[PDB]
Design a protein around this nucleic acid. Structure first.
Ligand code: UPG
Length: 394
DNA sequence: GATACTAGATAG
């Protein structure tokens, strides 16, 4: 019921993945709804995927370790301070020290909002100041009431009344993407299967490799996996002697899209570039197989980008089973969504589906629309940020 | 003790 000043703060730094995407998507919504916004991030630690999204023209970097004043001056110039990430466990005494001093000098007329974007305790543990950050917050959000942040970490800090933790969904303006990359069914290459994600076990990269060597490759299809970095978690792909063809983001045009080829792995990607390639690929894959406890209503940005750019979304079954439609709590697998639920113990019925859609384009374009409208209903900004804006205000 | 989950050093 009035225009406010917002400061989005990422103390971990600008990593270029989910948290960075949420902030940018948060900034756009606030701006579109009449509010002034400033996006601030700590550059004490740097990241590879720092340019995946375009923020360079408006984001404001700051070195907490040696710019406390500018930092304090920025975080105090708003009505709502939203912290999406906290210093990592490797920043250096000065950084985590000044960040803690910042939380002690945020004027009284500022409502501090804290979003916890991680899932597993293992990730939650690599945070510094997360406890102080949470106690200073006037509002807290998490991906699941039954996730680790809620059931374990909030138990360690509040064994005199524990703050409420509201649930949220990482929203995105789906229409902007569609209206920008969607293509006519004729421009799509039904033989290019494109997987996107990062090198982490719950991201289902293994099953994509398996699915390619056993179904797509043998059938003349081509597979591209975008976003795999040789993180330590990559050693396992070495031990498992899994066939592949790595490509740096510079030599993308030397990638071989012909049949009878191993999984073509792309290092890391620029988000707008990936969407363009995806909007012209027959099927996009996002096999996140997170566990029941961590799943409530939150789909991931990689999930939403697939629906939004005009491809046929191929997600992990269990995921769509545990998650619930935002409109009526019903499982995502209970709707005629057009989505193709991936079954690990039945990759043949999955492949068969892809084959059908691969033959007649009428049904294909009939399934996109249903998938798009379904993902729109479930997680577009228009709805989700308004839900959060209301919890933050009242 | 089995098992998920979590880019860096350095030279051009
Ligand atoms: O090299 C890359 C890799 C990813 N992306 C993009 O980065 C975002 C990644 O977000 P998401 O798909 O959510 O994956 P995570 O990086 O795992 O995001 C984390 O943060 C999100 C915000 O809440 C949560 O939804 C996730 O579960 C959590 O893992 C997407 O827009 C991707 O298109 C790029 O542009 N380039």
């Amino acid at each position: 019921m009035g225009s406010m000043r917002i400061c989005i703060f990422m103390a971990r730094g600008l990593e270029g993945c989910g948290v960075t995407k949420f902030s940018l998507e948060q900034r756009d919504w606030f701006i579109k709804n009449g509010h002034e916004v400033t996006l601030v991030y700590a550059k004490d630690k740097s990241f590879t995927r720092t340019s995946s999204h375009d923020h360079k023209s408006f984001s404001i970097p700051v070195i907490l370790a040696k710019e406390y004043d500018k930092a304090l001056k920025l975080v105090n110039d708003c009505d709502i301070l939203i912290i999406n990430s906290v210093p990592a466990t490797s920043v250096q005494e000065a950084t985590i020290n000044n960040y803690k001093k910042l939380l002690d000098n945020i004027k009284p007329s500022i409502r501090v909002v804290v979003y916890q974007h991680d899932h597993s305790v293992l990730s939650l543990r690599r945070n510094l100041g997360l406890e102080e950050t949470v106690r200073r917050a006037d509002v807290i959000f998490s991906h699941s009431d039954n996730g680790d942040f809620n059931k374990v970490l909030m138990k360690e800090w509040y064994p005199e009344e524990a703050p409420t933790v509201y649930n949220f969904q990482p929203p995105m303006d789906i229409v902007k993407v569609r209206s920008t990359y969607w293509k006519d069914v004729s421009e799509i290459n039904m033989n290019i299967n494109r997987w996107i994600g990062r090198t982490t076990t719950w991201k289902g990269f293994y099953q994509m490799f398996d699915f390619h060597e056993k179904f797509l490759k043998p059938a003349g299809k081509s597979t591209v996996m975008e976003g795999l970095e040789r993180s330590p978690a990559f050693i396992a792909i070495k031990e498992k002697g899994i066939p592949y063809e790595y490509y740096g983001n510079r030599e993308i045009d030397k990638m071989n899209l012909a049949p009878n080829q191993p999984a073509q792995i792309l290092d890391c990607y620029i988000n707008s570039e990936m969407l363009e390639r995806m909007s012209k690929s027959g099927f996009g894959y996002q096999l996140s197989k997170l566990n029941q406890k961590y799943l409530q209503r939150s789909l991931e940005y990689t999930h939403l980008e697939l629906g939004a750019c005009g491809t046929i979304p191929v997600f992990w079954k269990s995921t769509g089973e545990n998650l619930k439609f935002r409109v009526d709590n019903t499982p995502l697998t209970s709707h005629d969504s057009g989505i193709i639920w991936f079954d690990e113990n039945d990759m043949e019925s999955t492949f068969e589906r892809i084959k059908e859609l691969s033959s007649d384009r009428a049904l294909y374009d009939r399934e996109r629309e249903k998938a798009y409208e379904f993902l729109y209903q479930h997680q577009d900004s228009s709805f989700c940020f308004k839900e959060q804006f209301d919890i933050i205000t009242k």
